[PDB]
Design a protein around this ligand. Sequence first.
Ligand code: SFG
Length: 281
Amino acid sequence: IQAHYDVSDDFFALFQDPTRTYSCAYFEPPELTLEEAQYAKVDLNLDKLDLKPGMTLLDIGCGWGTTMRRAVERFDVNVIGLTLSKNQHARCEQVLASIDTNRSRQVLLQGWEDFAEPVDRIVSIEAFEHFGHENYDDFFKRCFNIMPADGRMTVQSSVSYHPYEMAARGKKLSFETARFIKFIVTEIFPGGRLPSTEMMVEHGEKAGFTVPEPLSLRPHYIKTLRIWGDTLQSNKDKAIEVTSEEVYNRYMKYLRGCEHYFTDEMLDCSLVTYLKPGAAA
Ligand SMILES: Nc1ncnc2c1ncn2[C@@H]1O[C@H](C[C@@H](N)CC[C@H](N)C(=O)O)[C@@H](O)[C@H]1O
């Protein structure tokens, strides 16, 4: 049943950029291409982490390996990536092995749950939606515990608003948004759950982290989703051929719907920074 909403890598290749990044890009400056903006998003995350040569960076949910490789290349760090996909695992291995570096590089097919080795810094870009609210305490506790005194982590995640906050916008739109969120979390990220930004901040605080004001990426996700959607739609027949009209329609619903709900400010995307007590200034 969870395996039903699994789709082949070749479908995603029909809307994503060459880096295969499956998360909000960063159009700064606005004229960047999707691919460029995916790299700008990687940098935006990594630049907040106080990475020094010879550190070990952990990528939780490392996808196809772009973040890790960019970190090795820019920061001359060791890396370790965690992924739940065997295909991502095999590709990441290739991406990592081909880097001209003496730094250590490792990809593991496992969750953060089973990861407990010392790392200096943590990046997690839109894996958090999969974890479920019941695991937030354990996630933050693990991330706090594996890092040294000056550790830092970024988590980037799509977020929703509490039903109470949504109600301020009127019942109609509020119930309609909740249904669409339920759809995201059934058919796009099965077993998933969108946090609110408050939940992201507060669980981090409870674990002991200092949490500055989160960065909103809402207009960047709008641009991202627009390009993703326009691109899927243009590759429609190729999409249907490799999957079905069903699966095509599902992702168009997702992509258009999210853009719509982002434009309406009924969804957000937060880049939250977590600083251990001894983190540098
Ligand atoms: N418990 C977990 N531990 C580690 N990775 C996970 C977990 N749950 C989901 N993921 C991964 O999180 C990733 C989710 C993607 N949305 C983001 C991938 C990547 N960071 C990107 O920006 O492209 C996929 O690699 C999933 O396998």
